[PDB]
Design a protein around this ligand. Sequence first.
Ligand code: HEM
Length: 153
Amino acid sequence: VLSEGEWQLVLHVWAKVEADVAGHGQDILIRLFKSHPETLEKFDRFKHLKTEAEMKASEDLKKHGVTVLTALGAILKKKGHHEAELKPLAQSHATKHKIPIKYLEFISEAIIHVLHSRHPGNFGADAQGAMNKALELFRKDIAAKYKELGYQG
Ligand code: HEM
């Protein structure tokens, strides 16, 4: 369970993200695909992209990144009260996309890398700790839902 103070560190950096969610989404997805190329293979729409340049130039990848970060933003703003938001996401990611928890750890890593790089003003050690706790909470709740749904994850 996060403290209010932890949630405020999370939402303070998220507010900066929201200055340009499309750019942040591109950086995060590209970092994920570069750091863990196996994750790209889950995306039938994107797995043809060969290079970072192709990824940066993809309008559809940018749109998807906005979709992803907007969903996660909505989850973070619930400050842990995210049961309703998690249900459809867990279902799609378990049953249609088949995303293991290990891959959710990888995208969590990518989020943290990007925030650390872009926002050292609002992502010092304490703030990163808070964001890690929020993402661990998300992953723990997603893992419990995967098990309910029948997916080992
Ligand atoms: C912060 C974690 C994540 C969030 C908030 C998120 C959010 C979303 C959202 C909102 C969608 C669109 C609706 C849906 O199908 O549920 C989506 C689609 C998808 N997600 Fe995720 N996602 C996350 C992590 C992952 C990861 C780690 C992978 C793969 C390694 C993944 C693979 C996919 C795929 C393959 C689709 C369908 C893409 C398409 O339209 O072609 N997601 N995700």
